[PDB]
Amino acid sequence: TPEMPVLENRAAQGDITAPGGARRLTGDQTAALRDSLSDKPAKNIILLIGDGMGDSEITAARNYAEGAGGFFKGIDALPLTGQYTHYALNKKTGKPDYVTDSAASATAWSTGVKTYNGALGVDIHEKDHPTILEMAKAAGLATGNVSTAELQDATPAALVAHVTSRKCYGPSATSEKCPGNALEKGGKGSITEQLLNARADVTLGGGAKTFAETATAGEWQGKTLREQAQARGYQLVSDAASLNSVTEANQQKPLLGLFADGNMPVRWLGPKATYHGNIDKPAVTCTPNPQRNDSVPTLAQMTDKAIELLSKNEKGFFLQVEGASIDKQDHAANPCGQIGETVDLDEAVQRALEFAKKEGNTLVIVTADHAHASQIVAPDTKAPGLTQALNTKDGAVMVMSYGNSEEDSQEHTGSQLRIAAYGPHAANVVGLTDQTDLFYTMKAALGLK
Template identity: 45%
Template sequence: MPAEEVTDNPDVSLQHSGAQLRIAAYGPGAENVIGQTDQTDTHYTIANALELGDWEVAEVNPDLQVDVTTAAEPVDARETCYLMNEDGSLAPGAGDCAQFGTKGQQIDDEQAKNVVIVIADGTGDSEITSARNYLHGANGRLEGIDELPFMGMATTFSLEAENGLPDLVTDSSASASAWTTGVKTYDGAVAVDLNGEPVPTLAELARKDGMKVGNVSTAEIQDATPSSFAAHALDRKCYGPEEEKNDESCQGEDFASQYRENGGLGSISEQIVDLRADVTLGGGSDAFDQLVQAGGNWGGNTWTEGDSVLDNAKSQGYQVVTTADELDGISAANTEEPVLGLFSEGNFPRNYEQSIPGIDGATGEAIECSPSPERPDSIPALDHMTTTAMDLLQNDEGFLLQVEAASVDKANHDADFCGQAGEFEEYDQAVQAVRNWVEQSGEPTLLVVTTDHAHTSQITTIDQNTSGLTSRIVTADGDDMVINYATAASNDHDVALGGQNHTGTQMRVGAEGPGARNLLGQIDQTDIAFAVSNSLGLDFVDHEIDLSPQWDSEAQYPVTDSGSTNTAWIIVGAVVLVGVVAILVYTLNARRKRED
């Protein structure tokens, strides 16, 4: 919208927005502001702390107390994060940009057996608030993330490749690399530092320690977030081994060293297979159809040149599934027979049909979101994939699982609120699935729930158009809500629907379980890596992971248990039952013979 139309139009205003806000506290009663609250709750927190009320005050829950006297002091990361070496290279390493270094906050030293990290891509406080309004109403509660007892806030900036200074609006791969490696890097980088050198990931540390590992996403499994968990690449678009079939951002002389025929680590798809995560579920089958360009023994597995990545995976022992029913047929997974689920050629279709905003959407008719027929039942829901993954990963040594709801971000880029709402609902259901699994299994599990970056959508005033595009939506309260999209270069649909951009605000981090208190307060995304690694006893600094090309090398990771703990006990129980039945039959037959 032209500037003069904004400044001279009484129907257009510079407005407040309706996102939830941060609240922090220190001192007696401070723990009562942790988690999801309403502003009116603050009144009672203050009144109860001062014993001003004439109402009955709830008893203290010892499980939610926080002893901040043990907390480490934050470091001045500005002195260590923006590093330039004498030769001009830029190389901040593990923990150099973290607020609390590699040792973390040290509030909570309880150890976890398992860790599950659940990500909603492109989901800032505005997206959380609008989804809650739509799904449950303004004073409702999201049944997953709002129930997490501990909340912190994380900065998300990446670093400029040219000078190592902050890039205040990150992309997803640099962001995901921060929490999977503890190292800040440049936009587009996948688990490499500013010099393009690979750095170890949480998944690799867990594999080295004998834990089981899972990687689940509703995006292409080669996309920014899942790839940063499982691979190392100079650019996030280095999907497959055929360079000419990849995006232009992974073509040419600057990226030739990525490919195996040129001595590199290979494409993201090849490296996903190399990691041999026990469970890998998502989209992206198209890139797995690309043909391998260099063959031989790599890390103990044989790659056949000229065969597709998928065919190589099958020949290397992978159990490949492409539908929800096939996934349900899998009873066990380990590194010798890992599960690779590829349920779509690209990203999963969204759950809701696309909504289209307009210049005058705020003053127009409200719309209601409807399920999309493009999301077939053959594609499993995220909560189902999450629960299945945990069942398959459960074992005596513990597991690490990353789960991503990818398309809150993708819908935001498209200015599609209904798409956002449907994908957010799936994300919150996945969080519920983890909490239910942990309660039922009783296993000490750290759950971390966060996002990679904020995004464009804002809640703005009813009946007030903006300089961007707006959609008017009916919420669960039966009231209307206006969502504004105004970060594209133009409001023309051919630009704006797909051209909305990330924003640079800090992000919410929720946590529950052993080590959860170490994610309270103001942290950086890299601090998440150390909260997780410390809770599992993993070490980003002192490790023996070889990140060089693995031609003619033996496997460097141990084989994991083929069955879950539950499965093992079921088998043991069945054997015992058969034995008991056999003894009873033998006893009865012997008695009959004596009686005869």
């Protein structure tokens, strides 16, 4: 009984060359919007983040994969939409810093406080602030954290770790870069160590490499972090079959899935964009990555499994799911990698909305941490940066441009970007808001004090 409707189909309704054929609506939307408005409490929240997934990135992927007049059945399906700002702060002056990194932005939605680029779960004065995940857990809710990146990376770590630098993955880097957080120095520990303490019910991702380090002090001194997790009662899975086999995940038997040494493999392969690549080279067609896997769970699969597991908690659950490599491939000026990760996120959003429609008390949110480099430009463009032409689903060429850095990595950009939601309290993402308003919306939605 989907009391609240999702947008079933907003693809062009007919022939795009004819009058009205490019319409995405079939009639007035007033009543459907009224029906999408509920202030009832949310039992559950599922927060879906496409890292670096700005409006440009969603547009490019739609054009490629679905066609210009196409529709992402997940991404584009959320009825309430708005734009949000994600500015960070300068540590020294406390003034705005126009372009955030993933650590400052994730800290923002996860704690409700602005911070400096590279900070995790701390403010500009380096004070710790409780995260939305720690709060939910303390309230009795089940908690899940899923990402295709290494688990120590910014987006997932922000929910469980409070360190002065996102670089402090394990004991060795923490000692050098976050001496104040170093276990041996009386601190709370490296990101990985804090993650082990946070003890969410379900944690699935990459980053097995760091689990090989040994703790420098404490109860588990001299053992590996992997050993520590086993000693601590975590159930460890490392492949798709092992994950599927899991029937329970909780405080007694928390699940920890480590599917790659670093980040999980990307869905699609293609060449890097190059200088005048749209003039000098032929059009590219993306191709599935063979290293992707049947033993490797996809984001949608990880999403479905977490939901099954966490759904067993009568009080409710909090789940964050990250499509991490949209950003990584945007930095890499690799259209196909970038777009393939966005189609990947869309499958995950579809799974989340099916559950939510069914359940009726679930708030689903789809947004990004910050904007990115990629731009859609005309085919005959002569640009200073890196470009590539692509053969889209329409049978037409689309060119993408990366022109904001002469360095090896293309840059994040500062533009406000799309926020979309479905479910109870969804109205709170409409209009202009701030990334910190999202923490407060989630908190109030679940009724946390």
